[PDB]
Design a protein around this ligand. Sequence first.
Ligand SMILES: O=C(O[C@@H]1Cc2c(O)cc(O)cc2O[C@@H]1c1cc(O)c(O)c(O)c1)c1cc(O)c(O)c(O)c1
Ligand SMILES: O=C(O[C@@H]1Cc2c(O)cc(O)cc2O[C@@H]1c1cc(O)c(O)c(O)c1)c1cc(O)c(O)c(O)c1
Ligand SMILES: O=C(O[C@@H]1Cc2c(O)cc(O)cc2O[C@@H]1c1cc(O)c(O)c(O)c1)c1cc(O)c(O)c(O)c1
Ligand SMILES: O=C(O[C@@H]1Cc2c(O)cc(O)cc2O[C@@H]1c1cc(O)c(O)c(O)c1)c1cc(O)c(O)c(O)c1
Ligand SMILES: O=C(O[C@@H]1Cc2c(O)cc(O)cc2O[C@@H]1c1cc(O)c(O)c(O)c1)c1cc(O)c(O)c(O)c1
Ligand SMILES: O=C(O[C@@H]1Cc2c(O)cc(O)cc2O[C@@H]1c1cc(O)c(O)c(O)c1)c1cc(O)c(O)c(O)c1
Ligand SMILES: O=C(O[C@@H]1Cc2c(O)cc(O)cc2O[C@@H]1c1cc(O)c(O)c(O)c1)c1cc(O)c(O)c(O)c1
Ligand SMILES: O=C(O[C@@H]1Cc2c(O)cc(O)cc2O[C@@H]1c1cc(O)c(O)c(O)c1)c1cc(O)c(O)c(O)c1
Ligand SMILES: O=C(O[C@@H]1Cc2c(O)cc(O)cc2O[C@@H]1c1cc(O)c(O)c(O)c1)c1cc(O)c(O)c(O)c1
Ligand SMILES: O=C(O[C@@H]1Cc2c(O)cc(O)cc2O[C@@H]1c1cc(O)c(O)c(O)c1)c1cc(O)c(O)c(O)c1
Lengths: 75, 75, 75, 75, 75, 75, 75, 75, 75, 75
Amino acid sequence: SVQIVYKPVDLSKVTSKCGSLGNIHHKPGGGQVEVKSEKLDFKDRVQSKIGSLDNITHVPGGGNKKIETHKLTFR
Amino acid sequence: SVQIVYKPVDLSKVTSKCGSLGNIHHKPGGGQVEVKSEKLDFKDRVQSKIGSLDNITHVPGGGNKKIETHKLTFR
Amino acid sequence: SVQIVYKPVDLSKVTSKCGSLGNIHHKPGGGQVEVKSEKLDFKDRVQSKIGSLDNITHVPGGGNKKIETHKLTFR
Amino acid sequence: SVQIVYKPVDLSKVTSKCGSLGNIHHKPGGGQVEVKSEKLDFKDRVQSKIGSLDNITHVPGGGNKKIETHKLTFR
Amino acid sequence: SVQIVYKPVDLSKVTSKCGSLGNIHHKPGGGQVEVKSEKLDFKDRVQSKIGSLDNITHVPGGGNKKIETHKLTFR
Amino acid sequence: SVQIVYKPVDLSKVTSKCGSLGNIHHKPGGGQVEVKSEKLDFKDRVQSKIGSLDNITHVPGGGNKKIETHKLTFR
Amino acid sequence: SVQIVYKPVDLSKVTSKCGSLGNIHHKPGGGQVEVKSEKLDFKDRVQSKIGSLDNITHVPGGGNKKIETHKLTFR
Amino acid sequence: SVQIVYKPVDLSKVTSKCGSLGNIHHKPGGGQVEVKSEKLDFKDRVQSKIGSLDNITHVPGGGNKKIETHKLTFR
Amino acid sequence: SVQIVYKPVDLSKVTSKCGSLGNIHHKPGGGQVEVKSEKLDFKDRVQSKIGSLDNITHVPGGGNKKIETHKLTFR
Amino acid sequence: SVQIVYKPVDLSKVTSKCGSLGNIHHKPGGGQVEVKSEKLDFKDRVQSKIGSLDNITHVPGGGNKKIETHKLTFR
Ligand SMILES: O=C(O[C@@H]1Cc2c(O)cc(O)cc2O[C@@H]1c1cc(O)c(O)c(O)c1)c1cc(O)c(O)c(O)c1
Ligand SMILES: O=C(O[C@@H]1Cc2c(O)cc(O)cc2O[C@@H]1c1cc(O)c(O)c(O)c1)c1cc(O)c(O)c(O)c1
Ligand SMILES: O=C(O[C@@H]1Cc2c(O)cc(O)cc2O[C@@H]1c1cc(O)c(O)c(O)c1)c1cc(O)c(O)c(O)c1
Ligand SMILES: O=C(O[C@@H]1Cc2c(O)cc(O)cc2O[C@@H]1c1cc(O)c(O)c(O)c1)c1cc(O)c(O)c(O)c1
Ligand SMILES: O=C(O[C@@H]1Cc2c(O)cc(O)cc2O[C@@H]1c1cc(O)c(O)c(O)c1)c1cc(O)c(O)c(O)c1
Ligand SMILES: O=C(O[C@@H]1Cc2c(O)cc(O)cc2O[C@@H]1c1cc(O)c(O)c(O)c1)c1cc(O)c(O)c(O)c1
Ligand SMILES: O=C(O[C@@H]1Cc2c(O)cc(O)cc2O[C@@H]1c1cc(O)c(O)c(O)c1)c1cc(O)c(O)c(O)c1
Ligand SMILES: O=C(O[C@@H]1Cc2c(O)cc(O)cc2O[C@@H]1c1cc(O)c(O)c(O)c1)c1cc(O)c(O)c(O)c1
Ligand SMILES: O=C(O[C@@H]1Cc2c(O)cc(O)cc2O[C@@H]1c1cc(O)c(O)c(O)c1)c1cc(O)c(O)c(O)c1
Ligand SMILES: O=C(O[C@@H]1Cc2c(O)cc(O)cc2O[C@@H]1c1cc(O)c(O)c(O)c1)c1cc(O)c(O)c(O)c1
């Protein structure tokens, strides 16, 4: 006799009031990357960037991340 | 006889009032990266950046992160 | 007979009033990175940046992080 | 017979009134990093930056971190 | 017969009134770092920066950190 | 009665023995030039470079400059 | 009665024996130049570089400059 | 009656024996120059560099400068 | 009756024996120059560098400067 | 009756025996120069460096300077 009463009430007013974004000027200059290898070995679970020269402008009008994880385990 | 009454009440007014973003000027100059290896070996769970020259401008109108983790375990 | 009455009441007025962001000028100059290795070996759980030359401008209109972890365990 | 009455009431007016951010000027000059290794071995749980030359400007309109951890354990 | 009546009432007016941020000028000059190793071995739980030349300007309109940890254990 | 006997004897063994030029590697990195004016006025004899970002590699197998000026004047 | 006997004998063994030039590696990093003016006025004889960011590698196998000036004047 | 017997004998063994130039490595780092003016006025004979950020590698296999000036004047 | 017998005999064994130049490593770090003016006025004969940030490596296999000036004047 | 017998005999064995130049390592660090003026006025004969931040490595395999000046004047 195991009885679980699971009642989460989530009330979130996750909200942004954001006016004008204005003037945004991005001038990334030029660079040089020189990288040398011979053998690469890797097995299972890999996120890798090798010699990545990049410009990333991620401007969202609202950045809202809500993460809820619920784990219930009986062995 | 195990009885669990799980009643979280979450009331969050996560909210931002943000006016004009104004003038943002980003001029990243140019650099040089020289890196040398021969053999790389790695096995399981890897996030790696090697020789990464980059410019990242992450401007959100609102940055709101809400993380809730609920774990209930009976062995 | 184990009985758990779990009643958290979370009332958070996490809120920012932020006016104009004004003038932001970022000029990162150019540098030089020289790094040399031969063999790298690593096994399980790795976040690594090697020779990373980068410019990161993270300006959110509001920076709000709410983290709640609830763990209930009966062995 | 173990009975737990868990009633946290959290009322937080975590709030910032912040006017104009004004003029912010960042000019990072250029430097030189030279680092040499031969073999690196490490096993489990690693966050590492090696030879990282970088500029980070993290200006949030509001910096609010609320962390609550609740652990209840019966063996 | 163990009975726990857990009633924290947290009322926090964590609040900042902050006017104009004014003129902030940061000019980090250029330096030189030379570091040499041959073999690095480390096992479990490591946060390490090796040869990290960097400029970090973290200006939040409000810096508010609220940390509450509640641990209840019956063996 | 003005009599000029002008007898220059120029014997120059201007000579270079130069072997192999070897390996020459030029990597000019990227820079940024910002220059502002409104009105420029200049009159006669002008060699001017304004805002000139350039790479010049002038490698001659032999650099020999012989300049002879002979001026004879009777008023 | 003015009589000029002008007899220069120039014997110059201007000569270089230069072997192999070897390995020459030039990595100029990236810089930033910001210069502001409004009105420039200049009249006659001007060699000027304004805001010139440049890399110049002038490697001659032989650098030989011979300059002879002969001026004879009767008023 | 003015008589000039002008007999210079110039015997110069201006000579260099120079072996291998070896390994030359030049890494100029990145800098920042900020200069401001409003009005510039200058008249006649001007060699000027304003805000010039530059790298100059002048390696000649032989550097030989011979300068001879001969002036003869009767008023 | 003015008679000039001008007989210079110049015998110069200006000579260098120079072996291998070896390993030359130049890493100039990054600096910052800020200079402000409003009006500049100058007239005749000017060599001027203003706000010049530069790296100059002048390595000649032989540095030989021979300067001879001969002036003969009758008024 | 003025008679000039001008007979200089110059025998110079200006000579250098110089072996290997060896290892030369130059790492100039980064500095900061801030200089302010308003009006500059200067007239005739000027060599001037203002706010000049620079690195100069002048290594000649032989440094030989021979300067001879001969002036003969009859008024
Ligand atoms: O804000 C910058 O000024 C803009 C240009 C400018 C000029 O040339 C001469 C002058 O008398 C005034 C002037 O005001 C301009 C301006 C731009 C705006 O976005 C703004 O909101 C403002 O009030 C006024 C700016 C932006 C730039 O991107 C830039 O590179 C820079 O050097 C300057
Ligand atoms: O704020 C900077 O001034 C802008 C340009 C400028 C000028 O050229 C001459 C002058 O008399 C005034 C002047 O005001 C300009 C300006 C820009 C603005 O965004 C702003 O809000 C303001 O009030 C007024 C600025 C921005 C820049 O990006 C920059 O590189 C710089 O050097 C300066
Ligand atoms: O605040 C800086 O002044 C701006 C330029 C400028 C000028 O050129 C000459 C002058 O008489 C006044 C003057 O005021 C300008 C200005 C910019 C502003 O953003 C601002 O709010 C202001 O009141 C007034 C500034 C910004 C810069 O980015 C910069 O590099 C610098 O050197 C200066
Ligand atoms: O605050 C700086 O002055 C700005 C430029 C400037 C000038 O050139 C000549 C002068 O008579 C006055 C003058 O006031 C300018 C100014 C800028 C402002 O942001 C501001 O609020 C102000 O009241 C007035 C400043 C900023 C800079 O970034 C900088 O590098 C510097 O040297 C100075
Ligand atoms: O506060 C600095 O003065 C600014 C420039 C300046 C000048 O050039 C000549 C002068 O007669 C006055 C003068 O006032 C300027 C100024 C800037 C301000 O931000 C400010 O609030 C103010 O009242 C007045 C300053 C900032 C700088 O960044 C700096 O490097 C410096 O040397 C000085
Ligand atoms: O001289 C450089 O070495 C070259 C590359 C290299 C290497 O990768 C690993 C190694 O065990 C030896 C090695 O010898 C190479 C080499 C190049 C030559 O031109 C050379 O005359 C020589 O004897 C031998 C060099 C040049 C480069 O351009 C460079 O960027 C660098 O880092 C190094
Ligand atoms: O001289 C450079 O080495 C070349 C490449 C190389 C390599 O990859 C691995 C290695 O074991 C040896 C190696 O010798 C190469 C080489 C190139 C030559 O021109 C040369 O005369 C020589 O002897 C030998 C060089 C040139 C490059 O352009 C360069 O960018 C660099 O990093 C290096
Ligand atoms: O002379 C540099 O070494 C080269 C590379 C290298 C290496 O990687 C590992 C190693 O065990 C030895 C090694 O000898 C290389 C080498 C290059 C030559 O040009 C050379 O004449 C020589 O004898 C031998 C050099 C050049 C570079 O350009 C450089 O950036 C650097 O860090 C080093
Ligand atoms: O002379 C430098 O060593 C080179 C590289 C190197 C190394 O990596 C590990 C090692 O056991 C030995 C070693 O000898 C290399 C080397 C390069 C030569 O040019 C050379 O004549 C020599 O005898 C031998 C050098 C050059 C560089 O440019 C540099 O930046 C540096 O840190 C060092
Ligand atoms: O002379 C430097 O040593 C080189 C590198 C090196 C090393 O890494 C580990 C080691 O056991 C020995 C070692 O000998 C290298 C070396 C370089 C030569 O040019 C050389 O003639 C020599 O005999 C031997 C040097 C040069 C550098 O440029 C430098 O920055 C530095 O820190 C050192």
